[model samples]
Target chain A: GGTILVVTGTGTGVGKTVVCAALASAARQAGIDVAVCKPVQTGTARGDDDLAEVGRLAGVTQLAGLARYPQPMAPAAAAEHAGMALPARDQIVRLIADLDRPGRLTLVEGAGGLLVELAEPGVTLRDVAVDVAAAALVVVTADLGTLNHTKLTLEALAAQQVSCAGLVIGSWPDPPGLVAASNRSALARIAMVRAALPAGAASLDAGDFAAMSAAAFDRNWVAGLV
Target chain B: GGTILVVTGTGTGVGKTVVCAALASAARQAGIDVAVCKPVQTGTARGDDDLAEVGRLAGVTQLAGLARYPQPMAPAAAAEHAGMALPARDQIVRLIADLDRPGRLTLVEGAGGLLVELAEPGVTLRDVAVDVAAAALVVVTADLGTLNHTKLTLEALAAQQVSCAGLVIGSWPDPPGLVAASNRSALARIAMVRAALPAGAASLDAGDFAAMSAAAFDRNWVAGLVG
Candidate 1:
């Protein structure tokens, strides 16, 4: 099995795409061959656009498939709206098919939260990621109330038997208060996943994400997982 | 203090409000006076509309406070865009102030999932419910992947010390599948959520909800919490 990285977050729009692009960019900069896959999209095409941008920016033109359901709903609803149902279990197998190429560092972006529903028979995006046996990276925002939300998300992922790719604290233009500050330590104590990245920068291009690697980003932080 | 119920779901948009409405309606039919409150809507009035509809169907006039933030984003961003400052921890204390009113069966619906934030400084919906000291009822869809979501949600609620109200399964057009069936037992044992509620015909009405009494819903559920 190749390195299947499943990138998720505390909630929707919590900057999974930016982090996903950043990681992909970093790997590409380090001279690694990467395969990117967005298992599903809801309410936007950022997944396709972001991964493609990463490939272009990182100088890896070989982007994997943009497997999508046409409707902008949860995978289940989106599938229903698009007149084609997405099978959770089978979709992973299909996504894995795209990673069949040799020495590919596959990055799989999931939809919604850790436990978001993708299709009927009621499989979720997380389930699909698990079916592909991907390592987990839970992106969080440095906002208040993140402690509980992040904890809830981590617990959910843990329940699914997913491994931690550690936490990436994305930028929040407005910093959170006491809860936000305290939650970081709390999360560190709870489990691994304690990497805190800067807030509020565009992840439009692959090189854009590559520039974010600083001492602020600890390579050893996630060395255990890799 | 009457029975204060905190309603949430395994994931977002899985009909938590509809089910809460059904439960509230059921309480009202039992001659129980139900007071409904949804303290936050991350954005979009659709959720508010559903909540209000649930109130109407439950025969409860004046469902209180559908707080909307613009930006079509999560509550935090939506609040940021709307120029409304996130409420202080004490602010929601005032917003849901009425829950402290005595002798009313208060049914409160949480916005988004358990950790959904409504503003900066991140005032999550769960914190407010905890402030009210309410018992919880987790709503979930009866489908394939519910097992992991529900199990994780239940455990998070437990870790938060939020009383696990009991689990209610929805979204199935017919009988639940393997995961749903297995989850009922797993939930009962670990999270102590009740057995799966066969919610096929249950409307988002008070009458439908009342049908899920302590008898209809398992009482032993949540009895053996934290084992």
Candidate 2:
């Protein structure tokens, strides 16, 4: 399949949705069809509010599926308690085939941290990507204390033998503050960081990050990201 | 070289104190001259509040020393902000020595979870246990939503290679809900747990678990625990 841009984060609620939205914006503007899948969403908002919001923003009209359990708990516990099985491994296989059409670039978003469990004794987001064979992008924050979280996330990705193609520092302001400024440099020094998307940058279908000349918005630093 | 029971939990406020208190209670009632030590406590309440209450209920006069950290935060962060050398490895070595007098069963309670950073990458609760050679007793709560947390705690223990004396599930009346009831069994299955002390039973003196010679609280069940 073509490149499936897999986006993960250090922890939950760290803006993985917005970062993927930005990348989707970048790709759509480049005249490419983009498809997005959350695969699994625990603690999703009402009427799939988060899904609708992200879909609306990223222009991802066709949602593959939305996985929600009764309690806003960890997916494994919630699924086990509610007597629901985890979305099958083949579901991810289907996502790669469905989204990776000849003219489309797919974006897959992971829930919680990189190492978060999917179900009992098996499968993480990293495993999902292995099934999809996608290029990995670790989305991080510019917060000062995010160093440990970021480093640990990298280790987890490596533990699964996931190739980190790039790092995108999300929610960082254009003119960086002290903590954000240091975190940008810290992440860059440690890992192959792509581009730091300033807060409220733009939406999918309105940016030029996917095109070859769109390299300005992409990270020149990810030369060795394989 | 008598046994030192090191009590720890999945996270702070998860019944490490309550369960350790119960273990202290059990040791003392057996007429095994046991010394209890809370080697480090941060976010200090009083010198005698939780552990003292455990001691008081256990009837062990040798409640002994408690390393109370003035600030009520994680030991690593607290020690970092306080500009103090967290108690040295020697301090723990010496403390255990002082209490592990011949014919004494010393129950040493860890300050926080295994990897609590006491300083920059050098001193963690994991390192402390290795230095003291204490057998670990992981006390856990059967509160709702403990599957991941409990798994992480057990994995952390296994990673450190500390000899686990097994786990103690705090039977404190779980929040009075179905979720709580579900978790009670969930924890038992995951932690390989053998003992389930009823809620508030940690305050009962050691012999109370078997006060009736009932099969449920049989002493024969834990006869070789220290060996």
Candidate 3:
């Protein structure tokens, strides 16, 4: 009745925030309590709050966060640009450890890709995943370079001895073309693609999004996640 | 003195062909005979010929390769689609070795990234590099996610002692934005960025490309590559 997953992607703007919401929404629809902890939220000066978006999409009240950088860049660069020090690595770990519960799926979403620095000493989401003992749920894309990026992300996880929860195509196009469809099939050969969220699922109302999430992944698999 | 380098990228379409051509041109201009070999070419159906691009752009006539797949996909996927097997690993190694000679720079351009399968049984460019004792010259992009991809590629190269020659930002955007500018510095911190080829280096005519290539890298470094 407990699980924690670190949501990381191959790169930026691959719908990392939206996937967080979809997974949170799906778990909630299943009557499983959900908690999301985004440790470092950049692009805040431009009003980029991942927690607020996830809350709006998932309707989960247990969302939490720690740092919010004004500039829209990697946490380390943004922090340096603002003449501020990154949050200590322990602080992020502590906040995440606090977010955990006996019967809930605590989702930790990172700033950029898996290796972006979230704190001093270049601590990454992968480091936090090791600290929290959570399996990594890699978010990937279905495109030309997706397979190479997917393999690289998976290798990083494997190198750290982190259990990969599997991959999720953060955004799968509605009218999928040859590259998308071919990549979808190819990605499955690498790891179980948990879900390929329909293109523009983020634009839907909560109800539609929840419905899509429910069908996006196998009910049994989501049920077994916690 | 002989030098063998495998040209790979962080991902596809990051201008691997352009980097290969630029380096080849630069080395040639430095009076080092250059040979570029591409093995297991894909996207022949879509007219994706990287070696031909190198030959046309850099004018390195000694081009060699093993297999060609019709579809524009990874070698593994393209090979399967074409109902053919990938080239054997030894064949690719032998081709590069044959291209190697004294006072020359021989480059083996991979199908995609470094870890991409270039031969049967999941043999990759990294494996091929190890077989030939060649260093890898990684091509990258000046984009948001480039640092991560470059870091991962560098780590993968390090795992096998496949020394990374350095990174070449395959395409540096014209009038770069904050992201591109910041990424250029960030990428430099990870590895020596040999050059950041200007935007649209591909569309340049041969004479312009050769001129651009000569100015892209330090002549000393290009001359030193063969030694």
Best by DockQ: 3
Ranking by DockQ: 3, 2, 1
DockQ of each: 0.12, 0.13, 0.65
RMSD to the true structure for each prediction, in A, is: 10.1, 6.9, 1.5
Residue-level lDDT of model 2, residues A21-123, one tens digit each, is 6666556656566677777666554343345545656566655554777655556666777788887767766755677766666777766666556643567
Task: Show where candidate 2 strays beyond 4 Å.
Answer: A1-36, A41-50, A56-84, A93-121, A125-226, B45-50, B64-67, B101-104, B119-121, B143-145, B171-176, B196-218
Tens digits of lDDT, candidate 3, B35-144: 88887799999898888999999998988877899999888888777888888999988888888899989888888777777777778889999999999999998877
Model 1, residue B146: distance off in Å is 14
Q: Report, for all candidates in order, the number of backbone clashes.
A: 14, 7, 0
Candidate 1 Cα outliers beyond 4 Å, as residue runs: A42-48, A97-104, A174-179, A203-208, A214-216, A221-226, B1-135, B138-227
lDDT (C-alpha) at residue A4 in model 1: 75
* Residue pair clashes in candidate 3: none
Of 1 and 2, which scores higher on TM-score? 2
Q: Candidates ranked by lDDT, best first?
A: 3, 2, 1
The CAPRI classification for model 1 reads as incorrect
